[PDB]
């Protein structure tokens, strides 16, 4: 069912995965790629970006979350025009910056396992340069509710992508919109769905209650038996929540 497509953003080749036509645009997390969203792409539809430096996209120097938001926004415009933007962790930071720069292209926001500030444990971030296996194991212990096939696969991916993982996490570590939400300057005017796995230790419940408190039209969904990787660990529950929200916002199903 899925297709891989390619577009050009200012000379940078960007790959995306796409399912059935739907105005939904997914943005993956650090050290990951569009394949993070396969369970959503096949059931809900839409497009998932491979950010530059990830998946089948070109490599290019990226020094901020804002720069990734530029690639994401251009890619959204070229594929779906306007969309519900779904971001996980780093991708949720990218989604927030995308909304702030280009609110017109966001029909709604889905903030998954993310935060207004994404400081990274120094034992992970500094541990990746010296003993990456230990750092990866620590990060993943905080990201999965259970070991098993998804955990093992992600562990191997991270071991294969340590350099990009460290670059991505360094961008997270510098990402901070917290006070701008707190002091009321940053306003999210679109419908928002905030999703977190009950066991998530990388971006815990309080990060998601923070969004829910500061965003007027937000709904919070905590998914039991999942941690940070909720869209992979509990995909059926995740999809049901997302589909209910898409109905609410009017992003119709368009079968056949
Ligand atoms: C790395 C870490 C220990 C640094 O902690 P720190 O030096 O206290 O600095 P922070 O800026 O994160 O936190 C300071 C305060 O802001 C709050 N805060 C930070 N990020 C927040 C967010 N996204 N939402 C709401 N509150 C937040 C904290 O709760 C804390 O409040 P407190 O003083 O009342 O406890 C901490 O951020 C952490 O444990 N993070 C989770 C693990 C991780 O590595 N996540 C990866 C994210 S990509
Ligand atoms: Cl991340």
Author numbering: 1 to 256
Manuscript excerpt for this entry:
Here, we report the biochemical and structural characterisation of a third esterase from the A. fulgidus genome, named AF-Est2 (locus tag: AF1537). This belongs to the α/β hydrolase 6 family and the X group of the ESTHER classification. AF-Est2 was tested against a range of p-nitrophenyl (pNP) esters and was shown to be active against small to medium acyl chain length esters (C2 to C8), which is consistent with its classification as an esterase rather than a lipase.
The structure has been isotropically refined to a resolution of 1.4 Å with a final Rfree of 17.5. The structure reveals, as expected, a canonical α/β hydrolase fold core domain (Asp1-Arg117 and Asp176-His254), and a cap domain (Leu118-Phe175) formed by helices α5-α8. The active site is located at the interface of the core and the cap domains with the conserved catalytic triad composed of Ser89, His228 and Asp200. The structure also contains two CoA molecules at full occupancy, several ordered PEG molecules and a single citrate molecule bound at a crystal contact. The AF-Est2 esterase structure has shown a novel binding mode for a CoA molecule which is located in a groove overlapping the active site of the enzyme where the pantetheine moiety is partially obstructing the alcohol binding pocket. There is an ion pair formed by the diphosphate moiety of the CoA and the guanidinium group of Arg117. The adenine ring of CoA is stacked in a pocket between the side chains of Tyr207 and Leu178 and its N6A atom makes a H-bond to the main chain oxygen of Arg117. However high activity of AF-Est2 towards the pNP esters suggests that the flexible CoA pantetheine group is displaced from the alcohol pocket upon substrate binding. The necessity of the CoA pantetheine group displacement for pNP ester hydrolysis was confirmed by incubation of the AF-Est2 with the disulfide inducing agent diamide which enforces the formation of a covalent bond between the thiol groups of CoA and Cys172. This oxidised enzyme shows no activity towards pNP-valerate demonstrating that this enzyme is inhibited by the formation of the disulfide.
